[PDB]
Structure 1
Amino acid sequence: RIDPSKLELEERLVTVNRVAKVVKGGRRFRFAALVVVGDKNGHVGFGTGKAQEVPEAIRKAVEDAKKNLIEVPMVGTTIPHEIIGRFGAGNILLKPASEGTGVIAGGPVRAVLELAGVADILSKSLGSNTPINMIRATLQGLSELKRAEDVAKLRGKSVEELLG
């Protein structure tokens, strides 16, 4: 479903890109923005930020962030299993680990996983070093996650039978 706006969003920015456009006179410098937005309890999202200024792009990032959020399973403050997302030439894989392992991730990706609350991820940016698509490389993989009690309900099977 759609995640409601009845939460506590923390919304720290990642990068700012100044982005041009060439008219009869000369250039026109605007700014681009993207802000990873969420709580620390499993809801992550973002939106684009476009303006003619610095701070109003920060404002309009929050709108589509509250229009588009997504939820992640938090089994033991980890991802419950291993997955590899492949959206648009930026491959970023996701590996779970033990609870002491911290958050080892790429630059913009590290400002995503701490905005999940999930603190145990190994990852490695296989694909390109572009900030929009690396975040698209994360949530697309995080969308394809599964829960332990859910797939047993999908299989019509016991949850403990998935473990033993």
Structure 2
Amino acid sequence: NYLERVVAINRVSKVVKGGRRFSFTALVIVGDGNGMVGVGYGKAKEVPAAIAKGVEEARKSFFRVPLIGGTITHPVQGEAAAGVVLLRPASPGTGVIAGGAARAVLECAGVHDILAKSLGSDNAINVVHATVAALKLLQRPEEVAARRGLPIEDVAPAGM
């Protein structure tokens, strides 16, 4: 009952005396589609096995995403090894304006209204890691107001 997206599958190799031993990696995104998403790498000698391992890794590594009604609360910039991803909230009309990896992550997390731009490296793994880093950096109004005081010193027009 989850949403699973396999993002990138590539064939890696290792050289031995005989020749090249091939294997497969399959980066997988898994999320409940509502507010919670996980990422798992996964790797094996066969594509379905790698996909499976990615699925269990992601499902074990679920984490929670702060939404404010179908979009993220405030703009953020996430930083992976060398991938840079910029996310900004948008009005309810907009869709998900994102690239491949970022779109996978956001649509599995259950985000409907986002402008996502990748500025650093183009590797899919690092783009995914930067996106999850930005989602970690995200904040909620309720604990920012808990940290500061008098939880009205913000702007909460919609609510619901």
Instruction: With the length of structure 1 as denominator, give the TM-score of the two structures.
Output: 0.91
- 5+ residue gaps, structure 1, are 1-7
Whole-angstrom distance in 1 between the partners of 2:150 and 2:75: 21
| Aligned counterpart in structure 1 of residue 136 of structure 2, from 135, 139, 143 | 143
Structure 2 spans left out of the alignment, 5+ residues:
none
Candidates 32, 36, 40, aligned match of 1:39? 32
State the partner residue of 1:163: 155
Partner of 1:127: 120
> Counting strand residues as a fraction of each chain, which structure ranks higher?
2
**Residue number in structure 2 paired with 1:74:** 67
TM-score, normalised via structure 2 length: 0.93
1:138 Cα deviation after fit: 0.4
Indicate the SS of the match to 1:114. Answer: helix
Cα-to-partner distance string for 1:25-75 (whole Å, 9 max, x where unaligned): 000111111110001111111111110011111111112112211111110
Give 1:152's match in structure 2, choosing from 141, 145, 156. 145
Aligned residue for 2:6?
13
User: 1:71-107 CA deviation, whole Å, 9 max, x = no partner?
Assistant: 1111021110011111211100111111111000011
Instruction: Determine the structure 2 residue equivalent to 1:5.
Output: none
Q: CA deviation at 1:144?
A: 1.0
How far apart in 2 are the matches of 1:40 and 1:10? 6
| Equivalent position to 2:19, from 26, 45, 66 | 26
Q: Which amino acid is 1:71 matched to?
A: R
Equivalent-residue separation in structure 2 for 1:91 and 1:142 (angstroms)? 13
Q: Secondary structure at the match of 1:136?
A: helix
Distance 1:162 1:29 in 2: 55
- Matched residues, percent identical? 58
Moved over 4 A (4+): none
Alpha-carbon distance between aligned partners in 2 of 1:34 and 1:117, rounded to the nearest angstrom: 19
